[PDB]
Amino acid sequence: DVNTLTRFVMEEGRKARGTGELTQLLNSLCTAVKAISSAVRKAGIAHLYGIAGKLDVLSNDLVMNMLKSSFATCVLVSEEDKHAIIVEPEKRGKYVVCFDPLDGSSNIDCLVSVGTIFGIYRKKSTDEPSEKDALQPGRNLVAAGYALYGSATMLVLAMDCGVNCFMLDPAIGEFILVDKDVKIKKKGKIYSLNEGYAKDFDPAVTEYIQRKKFPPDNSAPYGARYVGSMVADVHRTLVYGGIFLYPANKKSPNGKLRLLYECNPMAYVMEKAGGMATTGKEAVLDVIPTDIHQRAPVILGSPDDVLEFLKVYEKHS
Amino acid sequence: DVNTLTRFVMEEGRKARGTGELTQLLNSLCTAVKAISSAVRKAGIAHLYGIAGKLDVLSNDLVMNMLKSSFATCVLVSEEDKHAIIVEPEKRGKYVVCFDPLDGSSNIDCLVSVGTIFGIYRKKSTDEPSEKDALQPGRNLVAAGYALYGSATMLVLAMDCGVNCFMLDPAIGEFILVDKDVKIKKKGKIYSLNEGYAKDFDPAVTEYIQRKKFPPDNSAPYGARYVGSMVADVHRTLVYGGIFLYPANKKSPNGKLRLLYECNPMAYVMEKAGGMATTGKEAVLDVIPTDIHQRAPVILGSPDDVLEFLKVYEKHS
Amino acid sequence: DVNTLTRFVMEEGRKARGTGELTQLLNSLCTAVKAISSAVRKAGIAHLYGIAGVKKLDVLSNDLVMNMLKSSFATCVLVSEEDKHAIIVEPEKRGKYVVCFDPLDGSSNIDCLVSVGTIFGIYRKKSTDEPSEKDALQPGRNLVAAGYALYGSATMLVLAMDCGVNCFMLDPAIGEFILVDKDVKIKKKGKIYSLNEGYAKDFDPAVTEYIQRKKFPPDNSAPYGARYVGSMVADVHRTLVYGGIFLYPANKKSPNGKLRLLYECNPMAYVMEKAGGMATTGKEAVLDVIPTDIHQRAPVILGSPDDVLEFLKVYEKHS
Amino acid sequence: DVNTLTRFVMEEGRKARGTGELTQLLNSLCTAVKAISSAVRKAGIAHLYGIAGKLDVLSNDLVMNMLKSSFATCVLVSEEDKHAIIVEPEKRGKYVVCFDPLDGSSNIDCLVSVGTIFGIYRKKSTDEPSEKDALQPGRNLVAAGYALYGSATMLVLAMDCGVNCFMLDPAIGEFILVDKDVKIKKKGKIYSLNEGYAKDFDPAVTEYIQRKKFPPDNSAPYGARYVGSMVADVHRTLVYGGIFLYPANKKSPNGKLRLLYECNPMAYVMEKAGGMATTGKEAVLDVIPTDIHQRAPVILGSPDDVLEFLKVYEKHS
Ligand SMILES: COCCc1sc(S(=O)(=O)NC(=O)Nc2cc(Br)cc(N3CCOCC3)n2)cc1C
Numbered sequence A, B, D: 001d002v003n004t005l006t007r008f009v010m011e012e013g014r015k016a017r018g019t020g021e022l023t024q025l026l027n028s029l030c031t032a033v034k035a036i037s038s039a040v041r042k043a044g045i046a047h048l049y050g051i052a053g054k055l056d057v058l059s060n061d062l063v064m065n066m067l068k069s070s071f072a073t074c075v076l077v078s079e080e081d082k083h084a085i086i087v088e089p090e091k092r093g094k095y096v097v098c099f100d101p102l103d104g105s106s107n108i109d110c111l112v113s114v115g116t117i118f119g120i121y122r123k124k125s126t127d128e129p130s131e132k133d134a135l136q137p138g139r140n141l142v143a144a145g146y147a148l149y150g151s152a153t154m155l156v157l158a159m160d161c162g163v164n165c166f167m168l169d170p171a172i173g174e175f176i177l178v179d180k181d182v183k184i185k186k187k188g189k190i191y192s193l194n195e196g197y198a199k200d201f202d203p204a205v206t207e208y209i210q211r212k213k214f215p216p217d218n219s220a221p222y223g224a225r226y227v228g229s230m231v232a233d234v235h236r237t238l239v240y241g242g243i244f245l246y247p248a249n250k251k252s253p254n255g256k257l258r259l260l261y262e263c264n265p266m267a268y269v270m271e272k273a274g275g276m277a278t279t280g281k282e283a284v285l286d287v288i289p290t291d292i293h294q295r296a297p298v299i300l301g302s303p304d305d306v307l308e309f310l311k312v313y314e315k316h317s
Numbered sequence C: 001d002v003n004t005l006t007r008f009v010m011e012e013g014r015k016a017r018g019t020g021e022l023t024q025l026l027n028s029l030c031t032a033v034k035a036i037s038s039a040v041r042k043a044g045i046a047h048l049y050g051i052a053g054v055k056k057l058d059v060l061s062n063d064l065v066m067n068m069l070k071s072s073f074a075t076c077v078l079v080s081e082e083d084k085h086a087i088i089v090e091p092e093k094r095g096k097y098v099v100c101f102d103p104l105d106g107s108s109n110i111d112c113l114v115s116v117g118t119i120f121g122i123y124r125k126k127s128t129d130e131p132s133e134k135d136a137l138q139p140g141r142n143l144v145a146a147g148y149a150l151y152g153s154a155t156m157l158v159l160a161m162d163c164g165v166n167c168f169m170l171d172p173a174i175g176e177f178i179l180v181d182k183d184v185k186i187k188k189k190g191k192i193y194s195l196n197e198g199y200a201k202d203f204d205p206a207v208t209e210y211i212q213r214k215k216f217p218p219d220n221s222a223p224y225g226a227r228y229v230g231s232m233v234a235d236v237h238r239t240l241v242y243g244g245i246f247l248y249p250a251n252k253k254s255p256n257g258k259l260r261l262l263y264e265c266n267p268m269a270y271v272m273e274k275a276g277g278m279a280t281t282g283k284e285a286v287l288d289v290i291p292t293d294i295h296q297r298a299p300v301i302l303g304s305p306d307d308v309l310e311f312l313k314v315y316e317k318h319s
């Protein structure tokens, strides 16, 4: 039986018999994702170059405006905005959304994969809405996922029921369900990190990476892949198995990836698909944030690969 | 003034006062690339999943059929075909085309960027067309380039006039001229290779990559990027500068990449854009091939970076 | 504030506190309309003509609407211009709604790239008996929702419900139906009549005199213009947008008209009246005819209220 | 073998051994039509309605700007411009183009089919170009045709070699050759005109239409179709056979349609397809214009049906 993103959410939304705000939120998010994909693929670029005589800004504006107008959100945290956006009272709903509207777009000059990352919370305090409402642990996520604008445009959605993948058919502008209840391999064969920071690695990371290239059990060495765009890297890990690392280094002593709208949604997806996501010291999903743009070190992926790293991490205290 | 690929090629053909076969060839290849792109982006996937009731093969068939029906070709070498394809006599034209119809498609399941690589040679003799007509060194190339099916679709075309980049506007199916006569940085800050096989590196490769991570002076260590799809990694090298390595080692004395439809067209693009491309022992374009599928090692990118590799390469010779 | 078909239906559905089957029905129908649109605009035809080396459009349209409706879990009986008998949804997929639809109206002239369209009307199931074809023999008055997709110069979905008529433009760049005309109402009186005057030799006397009055007005006013696309969805949408009258009247050779009551006349009569217009068979309201055959025909005269009344004045003059 | 608009034109130009200007002309117009098609189908209308926060004017600008930049034209006559546009000197070529960029657009609110019509003349003298270059009889046409934005988008091109029909494949942005060397039926079964203006008909039109509803020889009456969009009605006459009339009456002694960029290109398309096109008194292509916007009555279509009209016209002298 064919399924679309909209029918899938609505059917899951009917079973839960909730208020319907989460469905309008996700439906609006889906529309923004299609608009972003169309602009990322350069639809209408001929008009910019004079056939008749900024991208991350457009993406943020698309997501901001579809979310505000859904009547489903109250607080919006974006990589593009310094402060949280408080939805005006007539459009206020009960959900908090943290999102990177176009992650990896700093390198978009080379047509590298980019993506949108999002995490959805139910507002937790009864106070008037403020930035504090987005400072929740990832354990509290109601919904999370990403759209990868890669060779094709895919939407990965994780909820309590698990992880589902939707391929965007651009001929009809519909998200088609193609991979139901996806689960990551117990053990992968690809590790993913920027080895250029090798001079600033902590000893556990140095030793773990050494074990991937020169296995102590004479097994096959892992291959390395690092796209430099987090959505593309995490999606490859989920589909192929393996491990993704962005640990702390000298230029980024608290890590580089953002906890609210990069690490937590990926940690959410990883855990619902049977993977792991750790900072080294604790679960990514267990970090309680204090700042909306705060950074975190992150190691995620197939459980055997993350546990093997934690085993090495504990060797170094 | 707005410019498209089709208007552009024709204007180059009129200046050159050629027979027009090469213009018909490039226009045919452009139509194939637009068809491949539509398929990579999953147009019509809704019909596959039962809404109303092969990707490397199709790419090959699109290029093959558009090339044969251009009346501009006589011999076709494909990554997908064991022997060269001899165009039937009624359709024979004067050019020889080597191509990879969908490079990177082994990992297309994770929606990594893929691409089409192509190199166009003039047939050299009036003898009956045969595979021997493809055994020319890359130096004899009349035209070469690639299509990157990335976050957007771009066609990079190199001729005697230089390297030009065309963006595909999917709204109108036209390739828009966006980067004229592009030149690679004299020196970059990114190195690209699969570091997972460090256990099998040539010792010279080991020392070179160590220098990128641990510079003996006070310069910045390079960042690492490796998509694992050649078109994307080389295109990132062209736009940003840096170095791309798929080198020879002991276990693979000739490298892994294919010379005719991976190494040569890219080596040609690099050199017309002011880069360098070497096997370690000689320039890629100078290798005389003896097998249409023979492998070659390739190291290309910014010239200062390739020369630094050659300096390390000679230290171990 | 931007609004979409999906957003619009869902919040209207939330207000009503209904079961949600109607929204999943409408959302599925939206998906079929976009897939039909893609095929009508000839997406992928290069492959038909051998770019690398399959089914007729009205067959594909029927399969798209049929399959999207069945898989919505919202329908029980489906009546199609393409199928002799009503289709009874299998039990595991059954919902409480009856949908009559024309999957691709006007396709007789699709070789000339004429405007084509999809027509649809949605009913509620009335009895607790096992679902059967007679559940589709309800009068148009019983319509829960009705509308059409017009595949013209652009693709528009016109949706009529109790809250009124709303028009949605398909933006193909993002595959979204954009609300562009809220609460549409037809002009009180128009300047265009629509019918096939080539068959005037077989006209009933009332139609002949009414068309005579349109070309040679007895009050020496300006004559109406004539437009006839020959594609029903295009002609009726022009009537709604510009005003005037659309006629497919009964004659001696076709005393019950030629258009089909369930999936052409009833949905169009529903849209017209929700937009403040009229639609009559000559003898009665289109929406009041109680059908006895799912493919039974009805004559139809619709459009602006003053133009239909002027027709009816002529109709009664001829008994 | 598959054929495209671009490949088809190029092969015709090679056979003729021309300067290439006419090929560069047609290729630019082909791109303008694809851009018009995209806007007509309402690409990007969501951005007009605030998803992130005229049409014939745009169409004129697209045609004007693609033709100017083709370097193949010197004089442009448009339904949208009162005076002819004289191409700037660096961009001047030897061809004169008359075009209606978006015909039927007054009724575009009801989504009636619309279209672009064009006729191409060679220039008249080496003197500095002027509007006088557009005052040619239709007989002097080098090429003419139309794009119909109907249920799908089709381009009909007429040259000395005949009439060919090209379908726009919107998934790849190519015009695919679908109807080669089309020939109109000798006799049709549909007549097309605005019967609402019957009070002012000349007796010949009155008597001819009478013959279509009430055949004196016991034949079947013709059907009536009138869309109100000239490209749509004329395309139907070509595809199904029959007759289209926008004739002269007392209030419009020269008709309503414009001779240079509505009547003449259609008469040329008709005559190259074996049909006829008359004003009643003479063949449309034989009218020598004295004003670029002068009107002409037109009756075109299947030859038996036009000849039938003419004898009714001559019966009334
Ligand atoms: C982890 O949880 C994720 C699961 C959830 S819950 C939500 S929700 O909160 O938006 N709820 C609803 O959309 N509900 C809903 C929707 C429709 Br259609 C009909 C009805 N019914 C009307 C008749 O009476 C019964 C309820 N309800 C979305 C998702 C994906």
Ligand SMILES: COCCc1sc(S(=O)(=O)NC(=O)Nc2cc(Br)cc(N3CCOCC3)n2)cc1C
Residues within 6 Å of the ligand: B009, B010, B012, B013, B014, B016, B017, B018, B019, B020, B021, B022, B023, B024, B159, B160, B161, D017, D018, D019, D020, D021, D023
């Ligand atoms: C090393 O740079 C190669 C550059 C080249 S050459 C070719 S080509 O081989 O296809 N040739 C032509 O397209 N020729 C051509 C085209 C047109 Br339109 C008109 C004329 N005419 C000759 C002059 O008189 C008028 C007619 N010629 C393609 C490219 C990209």
Ligand SMILES: COCCc1sc(S(=O)(=O)NC(=O)Nc2cc(Br)cc(N3CCOCC3)n2)cc1C
Residues within 6 Å of the ligand: A017, A018, A019, A020, A023, C009, C010, C012, C013, C014, C016, C017, C018, C019, C020, C021, C022, C023, C024, C144, C145, C161, C162
């Ligand atoms: C004919 O025009 C009538 C208008 C109607 S009614 C229907 S419906 O029947 O499909 N029902 C619903 O859509 N219901 C619905 C949907 C969502 Br989301 C949430 C909730 N609620 C959850 C919270 O608790 C209350 C119910 N309900 C569709 C239309 C367009």
Ligand SMILES: COCCc1sc(S(=O)(=O)NC(=O)Nc2cc(Br)cc(N3CCOCC3)n2)cc1C
Residues within 6 Å of the ligand: B018, B019, B020, B023, D009, D010, D012, D013, D014, D016, D017, D018, D019, D020, D021, D022, D023, D024, D142, D143, D159, D160, D161
């Ligand atoms: C009105 O129907 C006439 C048909 C015509 S003529 C023209 S044209 O005027 O633009 N000319 C050319 O396109 N010429 C041309 C094009 C190419 Br590619 C190569 C060469 N070569 C020069 C000769 O040696 C071989 C190479 N020439 C277009 C059309 C469609």
